[PDB]
Structures are given as C-alpha cells and as structure tokens.
Amino acid sequence: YEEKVIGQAEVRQTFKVSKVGTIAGCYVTDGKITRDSKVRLIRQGIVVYEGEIDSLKRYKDDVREVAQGYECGLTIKNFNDIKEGDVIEAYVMQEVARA
C-alpha cells in the first residue's frame, strides 16, 4: 500500500493572533485533516509550506479529524506563511485518527 493523501484541504484562513497561534483553517476534499497527520500546502506556483499539524480545534471543540467536507481551525507545524495562504495537503500512512 502507498501513503496516498490522508487529509487534503483548502486553507480558509489562519490565526496569527497575539493570544492563540496560527490556527489555520482548511476545507477538506480528501481523507481527513487530523492531528496525527502531516501537511503540505501549495500556492499557484510551488510549495507554500510543509510539515505536520500543530493542533486541531474547530469552532465547536478540539476535534481529532475533519473528513467528508468539514472545515476546522488547525495550526500547521511551524508555519512561516499565514492568513489563507493556499491549499493544504495532509499525507501519511493508514494509521491516522486512531493512530
């Protein structure tokens, strides 16, 4: 088996607040945008940033994933670029959410 997409989404926005962090929201279009997953966004030319998720917290609670088509606010590792930069892409193995 290959480590295909496990959480592809599109940045909604981010939270570069002087109280929170950089809670980057993303609309999902593939697997799940979970805490136990990596991340890889891209602009209209190249990669905007890469790594993993820092935290996972929606507008309701601290959800672990965001599959189907739900948007949740999550930080993306040590994100240098902020505010709805572009489309994000979570990639990993088949051990997400439950592992």
Burial, 98: exposed, middle or buried (Cβ in 10 Å; 0-12, 13-18, 19+)? exposed
Within 10 Å of residue 72's Cβ, how many Cβ atoms? 26
Q: Cα–Cα distances in Å, from 45 out to 28, 48, 99?
A: 21, 9, 33
DSSP class per residue in 14-69: ----SSS---EEEEE-SS---SSSEEEEE-SSSEEEEEE-SEEE-SSS--S---TT
Helix (H) or strand (E) holding 88: strand 87-91
Residues 75 and 77: their CA atoms lie apart, in Å, by 6
Assign 91 to helix, strand or coil. strand
Q: Assign domain 1-99 to a CATH class.
A: mainly beta
Task: State the structure-solving technique.
Answer: NMR
Those residues whose C-beta lies under 8 Å from the C-beta of residue 62, and which sit 6 or more positions away, are 55, 56
What are the sequence ranges of the domains in the chain?
1-99
